[PDB]
Amino acid sequence: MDKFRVQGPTRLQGEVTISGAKNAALPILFAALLAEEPVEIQNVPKLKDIDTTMKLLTQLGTKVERXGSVWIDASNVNNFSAPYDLVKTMRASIWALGPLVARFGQGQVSLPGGCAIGARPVDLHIFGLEKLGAEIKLEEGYVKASVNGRLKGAHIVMDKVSVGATVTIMSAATLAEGTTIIENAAREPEIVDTANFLVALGAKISGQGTDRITIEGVERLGGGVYRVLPDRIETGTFLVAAAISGGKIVCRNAQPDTLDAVLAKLREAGADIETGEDWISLDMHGKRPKAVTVRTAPHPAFPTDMQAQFTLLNLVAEGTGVITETIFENRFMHVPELIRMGAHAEIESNTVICHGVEKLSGAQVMATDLRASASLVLAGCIAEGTTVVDRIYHIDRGYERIEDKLRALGANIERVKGE
Amino acid sequence: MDKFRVQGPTRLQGEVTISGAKNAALPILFAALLAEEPVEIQNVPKLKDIDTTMKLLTQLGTKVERXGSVWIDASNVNNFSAPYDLVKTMRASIWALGPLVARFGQGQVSLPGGCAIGARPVDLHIFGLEKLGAEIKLEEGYVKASVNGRLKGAHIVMDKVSVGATVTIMSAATLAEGTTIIENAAREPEIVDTANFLVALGAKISGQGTDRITIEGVERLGGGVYRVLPDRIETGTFLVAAAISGGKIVCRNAQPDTLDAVLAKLREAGADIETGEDWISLDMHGKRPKAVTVRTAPHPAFPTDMQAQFTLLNLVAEGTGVITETIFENRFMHVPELIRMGAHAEIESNTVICHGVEKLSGAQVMATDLRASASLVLAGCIAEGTTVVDRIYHIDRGYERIEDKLRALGANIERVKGE
Amino acid sequence: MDKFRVQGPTRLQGEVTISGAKNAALPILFAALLAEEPVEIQNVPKLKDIDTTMKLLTQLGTKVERXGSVWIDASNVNNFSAPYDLVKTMRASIWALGPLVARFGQGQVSLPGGCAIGARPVDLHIFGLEKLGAEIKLEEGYVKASVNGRLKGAHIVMDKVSVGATVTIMSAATLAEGTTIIENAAREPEIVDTANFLVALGAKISGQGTDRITIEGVERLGGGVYRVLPDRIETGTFLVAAAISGGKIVCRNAQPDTLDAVLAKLREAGADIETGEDWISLDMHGKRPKAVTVRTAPHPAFPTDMQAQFTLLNLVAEGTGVITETIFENRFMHVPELIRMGAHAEIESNTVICHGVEKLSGAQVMATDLRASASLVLAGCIAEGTTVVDRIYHIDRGYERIEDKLRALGANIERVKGE
Amino acid sequence: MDKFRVQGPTRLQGEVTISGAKNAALPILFAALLAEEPVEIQNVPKLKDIDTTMKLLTQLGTKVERXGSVWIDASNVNNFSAPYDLVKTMRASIWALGPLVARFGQGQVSLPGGCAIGARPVDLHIFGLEKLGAEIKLEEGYVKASVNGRLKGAHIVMDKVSVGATVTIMSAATLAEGTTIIENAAREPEIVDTANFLVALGAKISGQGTDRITIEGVERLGGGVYRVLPDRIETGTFLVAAAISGGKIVCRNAQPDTLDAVLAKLREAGADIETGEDWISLDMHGKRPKAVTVRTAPHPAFPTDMQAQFTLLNLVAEGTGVITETIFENRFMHVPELIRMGAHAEIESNTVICHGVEKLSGAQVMATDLRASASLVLAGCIAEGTTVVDRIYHIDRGYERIEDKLRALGANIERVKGE
Ligand SMILES: CN(C(=O)c1cc(OS(=O)(=O)c2ccc3ccccc3c2)ccc1NS(=O)(=O)c1ccc2ccccc2c1)[C@@H](CC(=O)O)C(=O)O
Ligand SMILES: CN(C(=O)c1cc(OS(=O)(=O)c2ccc3ccccc3c2)ccc1NS(=O)(=O)c1ccc2ccccc2c1)[C@@H](CC(=O)O)C(=O)O
Numbered sequence A, B, C, D: 001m002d003k004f005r006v007q008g009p010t011r012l013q014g015e016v017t018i019s020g021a022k023n024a025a026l027p028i029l030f031a032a033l034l035a036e037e038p039v040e041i042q043n044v045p046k047l048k049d050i051d052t053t054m055k056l057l058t059q060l061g062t063k064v065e066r067x068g069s070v071w072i073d074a075s076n077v078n079n080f081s082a083p084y085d086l087v088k089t090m091r092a093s094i095w096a097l098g099p100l101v102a103r104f105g106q107g108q109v110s111l112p113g114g115c116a117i118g119a120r121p122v123d124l125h126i127f128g129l130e131k132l133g134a135e136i137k138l139e140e141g142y143v144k145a146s147v148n149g150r151l152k153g154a155h156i157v158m159d160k161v162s163v164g165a166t167v168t169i170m171s172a173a174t175l176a177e178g179t180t181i182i183e184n185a186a187r188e189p190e191i192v193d194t195a196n197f198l199v200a201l202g203a204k205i206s207g208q209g210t211d212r213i214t215i216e217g218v219e220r221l222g223g224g225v226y227r228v229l230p231d232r233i234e235t236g237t238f239l240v241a242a243a244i245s246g247g248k249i250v251c252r253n254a255q256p257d258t259l260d261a262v263l264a265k266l267r268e269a270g271a272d273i274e275t276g277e278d279w280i281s282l283d284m285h286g287k288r289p290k291a292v293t294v295r296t297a298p299h300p301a302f303p304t305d306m307q308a309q310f311t312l313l314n315l316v317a318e319g320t321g322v323i324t325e326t327i328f329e330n331r332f333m334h335v336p337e338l339i340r341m342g343a344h345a346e347i348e349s350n351t352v353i354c355h356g357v358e359k360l361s362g363a364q365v366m367a368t369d370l371r372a373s374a375s376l377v378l379a380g381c382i383a384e385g386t387t388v389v390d391r392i393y394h395i396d397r398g399y400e401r402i403e404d405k406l407r408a409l410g411a412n413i414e415r416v417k418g419e
């Protein structure tokens, strides 16, 4: 069981190049199944799910190869059944369903085998595809979706805002006959990037980023080159890394417009921020951060995926600040780990009251949440002494070489084996 | 477009005989598809959905004939497809699916509708049957279900409490091999009555009325006689009719234990209530009702289907009272119509604050909700002058000729044609 | 009972001058009690609540006079008890409490009678003042806040985001000793305007418009001239008026940056929009609006107060659009009224599915909600025939001479008496 | 910092005598302030809050002595101010306010007051007494209340169901002039016990245990003897101890009717249960428990205070079960700790998916929640090896001699000092 042994305190400053967001690459890679001609997807990080996706595609007959980018030739996809073995490892597998039925008339993917009925997020995808006119067969724990001829554009009203369903329906719609309208579509920048990728390939899509996306089905999609957008959460993580340690950092290969809320919130924390076309710099001028009030909400509002990091910011800030989770629940579990490092905080409902302290103290900590865990690593970097963050594989699955990037900013960090 | 013209004010008093609840008759009638020998279902109201149901059953090869009861012979069901032009008219149609698959190994019900993903009742039925071992198929606008051998008893966890799915799973489970357990099962009296009907036919069910139902599949179900339970909402409607007009009334053919919450609430209003084995009496002794506090909640708590009527009660009562709806979002379309009749009320979220007035004024009103509409008719009976309630067909589908019953209580009411 | 008789259809085009938002005038007027020298508040609409406010202030010993602006001389306030008869008429009465205690060490106001322990929004104002160090007295259905010397700065965490309390706490804090921090502060433009008015008088406030306001108490506040911000809701009502009638309009004396969400949404409807420093223009080029998907949320997201109007826009638009209300659970009481005029819509929870028609029909309609009512008047303007909107006094309280501004845009409208 | 060192695995079996519920004793003890003649309160556990309450009562001039019971002579209460250092230690202190004002016309309690406006739980107590006619004064960080003559019975609507406020209002009302009606009152068994205690002293109360309580004020309350009801949560803890260890146990001095939902839930888990008039027996017949579905809700439904215990039951049971919390969003802090002991579970919102494992492994764990912590000691008892539960003072506050009771069932447990 790998883990991170950190030594603090260390001022984190310098530069970092932001990787491509896997949250955007994943939906794009599966969207690539629609491409009749070769596609070069640039700026894809090297993470477990990317490997898994490449294997799954290859086992569907698509020629795949990578490096900084992943090259895809889906001109000859001839197998339409996603193998259980690869599918079981990730939520993104479901995305191979829509493209296959839309382009080849058939797709089969295994489904989770819980016990609860009317919840399985996967159900929206199945119904979304049925709305587009796919015949659906639910048997032996899987879904076999198919259609005779092309799918038909439909007017779809999403009851729940779903990032996953938005991608399935939008991707499938690009090859349907007619127009598809998705009301209450997920607005995430990653949706926008997937929309833009499909457009780059010849699709007709507008309204991405808003509450309703409109797709005008076309005969087929070509190929080409497309660059995955920067990881806005990785960016936030590092901006907070500088913001909580009196440092100054510049994030390269970044996209400022996906972080209006986070940037504004850092300024309120007292950060001196400048942005360029593809970079963001943050300077604390050696000062401690000033406590802020945070309210997580749907994009473009403050992102829940930046919450654990700002919680940490407040715990080491000047004053008191309350982080409110307006949407999710049981989201402050990493907080007791921070308290063990000396932080002063009270959890009350969907709220955590933060009382900044001078310095945190090294301790042995662990967090199952990816972001909560990265927060524990930044905490270790500015804590007095030695901090040991366990089960860091959660971080490895979402961040590309975080230790190398942190070390380059001044952190004393070492990965270790043996449980 | 039929409508009711009412002349008020009148003190509603006398007696009324409560009809059988169509909400229990419908699920029972479809459950009868499992009966191998003749069944006599007594106390069935004469309402539109009952006719449609009788036509649908006949279309499937079952011998149907009615009057006060419906005599069913499903010994020879030989067609397992519920035609689209018989299904599109009512939700209850879906209940033919489970019984056909369970008894004959196959079935299909036309699937009307269109929009709304995620929240598409029927989804629950589909997965319930699949969990019981059936292979689902969605094609040609049909929901199709088949199974090899009998359905397999299964332990099912209902994510959302659902009356419709509870009926489908419970009914279908009676003929499955093994035990079926339904967690978080609908608790309504109509579920309980359906369970009892099935038990009357030879089924093994226990727990009906609670969070979890347990069914022990048997070889086959026989026949017999069963009386549909009284319509608790119709009963509540007439008790309120008297409670808000200083009247006295006795409801015959009633079942008191399905109304603890409603009767308790009326006493709080100052009603003097008496109950028997099969009757309930209410006397206001000429007094205005006293304002009450109401909170709709899951059965056995106060029923949301009695909410509109109690809003009326508070609006003509002594004092201020607050109606709280913890079940339906926007279930207050009756409030604006009442205000035009001179009622003083403020809507504040899932709440309506009521300021009882001495009297209401006749006015032209209309409401699409069945219960809100019935309440407008009552409002007209006690309002000064002439009231015209339009689109009363909403009432006709759920109440067995409410105008005759009301008139016997003293009301001056006329059904009129011409838009 | 006054009402509007409207003759349709008429294309609404031309120009309109936007009045000041009474929603910002009210809090500012009461804030003026803190001014030690004369204050000229410009751009104040002539509405019922403004008259009441001027009367109330006069009863406290302030010299008040008005026209386009209101003059306030609070240098000699000598009576610190807001009279019941003037206070009972409007919610804004509560805003006289904080200033009186903060500047004179005492203020007394009557409170809403009844029950609903826990509901009352005035509680937040009371407890807010208590945190600032005020001695509170709750007797005989009213409040007495008093302080010996000055109030003291405090760190306050708002559990509920409250426009009213934010104003009370923020205003009173301007004269307190030390720093006050309000977390989870209301972010509305009107709060921002009040903050700026206070600042103009010498207060030290920052963060207005964000989740946390910070105030630095000062010895005293001076006087001056301040102009109330444009009514962003009146503005939106008029943009929609043009947007649903193939019209073209220019809104003068407007403030574009308070409507980012509304302007964007109108563009999605197909409106051609250009804005300037103090004006906004909208041109449909004789086209019907295209249906839009709307999700009301907290400012700066799409405003719930524009919801009724956009519902109307969709109902006459091309296509289907759903309006989800994440805010006010209930808020579609206007829909039924629009249906009677021929609109096709379905209410599904906190949602209304709209199916645009080409032409609405005149009818007799009424709505208690201010915005809903103004929508009916707009509906009547584009409807075929005659429309009669009753109970227009609701509109008269929130709109300054709406009939005069509509007529100038070409509407055929006239006010009528006799119930 | 004391802590428990546990040796597993051991089969917990035998008998345990259930203590009085401190949750009933506390409200009863303060209610005893209304007694004019000596009162013997039997079956009171020996816990920190009881000692604190006895000291506080003593300060007020009440003669107090104790052992199994707490004898009270409040005939001579002559000081009506609960001192700050004597109040700051527990929430129950607020219960001294109402009786003092009701019986002596005056009282004041020191106030906590940190942040959280419109969320401070003492507000309801305050507004409650005000509805009863008391003058409220907030100053000196005290809540002073007084009344002219007696309190006046009022009709009070509770917006939030509140255990604490229900007690303050109900208790104070026993001496008010006229009738008091509490709508939406807390229904807990501890409320009912407090009602019966007051009735035992001569009070007139009815409806306790339901939605609305009605109190008819009397001249004065006398003295006597009353036995505090058994700790239903403690009972539940022990039944789970046997149920998760293949054990058999008999709980003496118990009250079965306060645990309907818990007992039913245990039967579903496979427990063989028998109950008597004052005892409950549970037998697993050496078998593992079966996984169950649990949804916490308001009493009489499944209690949130038994939730951590049942989470543990599922985690060592046969199969998968999802635990749902609709009361306390973060009542899951025990899972991370249980996973560390080898359990397999996933948290998802107000839910925790549990996958039972054959046996758990000892580890070092700690939980701040009283119940979560007691569950860790149970996990320790059936865990393989040696478990150490830190900061067990949380358990000491709410359970009387848990070690001694656990030891007598067969556990290997030892308390240890030194951090
Ligand atoms: C994001 N979502 C998911 O569960 C999710 C994550 C996936 O994979 S990722 O990690 O590459 C990814 C991709 C795009 C993202 C965009 C914005 C933010 C985060 C992202 C993460 C891929 C699909 C997803 N959603 S889904 O409806 O097809 C889906 C598919 C299969 C599942 C199987 C078991 C349980 C849940 C499942 C959900 C949830 C996350 C949550 O539960 O808070 C949601 O709320 O929308
Ligand atoms: C009850 N439910 C339904 O929509 C419902 C009503 C039906 O028929 S009834 O009128 O004979 C009936 C039967 C039992 C009742 C018990 C308590 C209260 C009212 C009842 C009414 C029969 C099935 C229903 N639900 S369902 O999931 O299979 C179902 C089936 C087919 C559908 C087709 C299109 C749209 C919705 C559908 C819902 C709704 C009722 C509502 O929305 O107010 C619910 O939310 O629970």
Ligand SMILES: CN(C(=O)c1cc(OS(=O)(=O)c2ccc3ccccc3c2)ccc1NS(=O)(=O)c1ccc2ccccc2c1)[C@@H](CC(=O)O)C(=O)O
Binding pocket: C022, C023, C024, C026, C027, C049, C090, C091, C092, C093, C094, C112, C121, C122, C162, C163, C164, C165, C188, C190, C191
């Ligand atoms: C705005 N608010 C109110 O209830 C409200 C309205 C007032 O008056 S107005 O009409 O001149 C006005 C002023 C400023 C505004 C700024 C942005 C948006 C709308 C505005 C309207 C003045 C004060 C208010 N809020 S309050 O907490 O002191 C308050 C005070 C006394 C009350 C008495 C009975 C019932 C509710 C009350 C609320 C509510 C409105 C609601 O949600 O129903 C809220 O959103 O919190």
Ligand SMILES: CN(C(=O)c1cc(OS(=O)(=O)c2ccc3ccccc3c2)ccc1NS(=O)(=O)c1ccc2ccccc2c1)[C@@H](CC(=O)O)C(=O)O
Binding pocket: D022, D023, D024, D026, D027, D049, D090, D091, D092, D093, D094, D112, D121, D122, D161, D162, D163, D164, D165, D188, D190
């Ligand atoms: C019980 N209640 C409390 O927060 C609570 C607990 C107290 O003390 S105990 O531990 O001896 C106790 C007594 C009776 C119980 C009955 C059923 C279940 C648990 C119980 C626990 C004593 C008073 C309480 N509530 S209160 O409104 O006067 C109160 C009083 C003073 C406070 C000071 C600071 C912060 C919060 C406070 C809350 C809450 C518990 C919850 O939030 O779930 C409620 O259900 O309303």
